[PDB]
Write a protein that binds this DNA or RNA. Sequence first.
RNA 1: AAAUUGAAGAGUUUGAUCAUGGCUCAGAUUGAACGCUGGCGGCAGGCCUAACACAUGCAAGUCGAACGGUAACAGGAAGAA
Length: 155
Amino acid sequence: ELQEKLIAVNRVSKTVKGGRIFSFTALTVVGDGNGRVGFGYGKAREVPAAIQKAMEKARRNMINVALNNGTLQHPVKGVHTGSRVFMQPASEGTGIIAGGAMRAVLEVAGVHNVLAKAYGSTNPINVVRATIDGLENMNSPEMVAAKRGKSVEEI
RNA sequence: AAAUUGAAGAGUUUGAUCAUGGCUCAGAUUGAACGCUGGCGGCAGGCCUAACACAUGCAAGUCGAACGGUAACAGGAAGAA
């Protein structure tokens, strides 16, 4: 019972001897809403087939996120090719302050309160890749506590 | 007790892509102006330009418990109706 969200549909084209060959690419994201989120990207000669391929690729290739009561553990920075992403944990009641692709990722991921901002290029594919890379690199107090070989009294 | 609890993007270069990069938009705000329209009230605001020139009226008077006074109006007055 995971939530699936179509982020962007784009029409690309390859040229051949006869003319242009138009195909469609769809970027989606799925997530169970409590710390697991994955994005899929499918190209197809039609829009519904592209969305189906994106959903199948997104249902696999899902990552785990260490949430903290529905928000981030700490401010994180995600970077892909052109997009640099900043996410920050907020208090209860603020919502998701983020762009379209960031909103989709953080909403299907299970994040409820976050202050986010996208720098550089706002390309949807690179934005969702940067968001996923920033969320999977976010660690919890138990992780750092066990990695430091000392109790979790820092929490 | 409270008195920083706060951060959104989109369109456009290409047959298509990523990046760079500028232009434009979505938000607030104003001593505002113009166009169409216009019922009431409360609170505020109202020459941003020519520190250009000014008709007219007012905007700095007051004290007789400082003084010599009596010109005006109100009285007291002696004497002539």
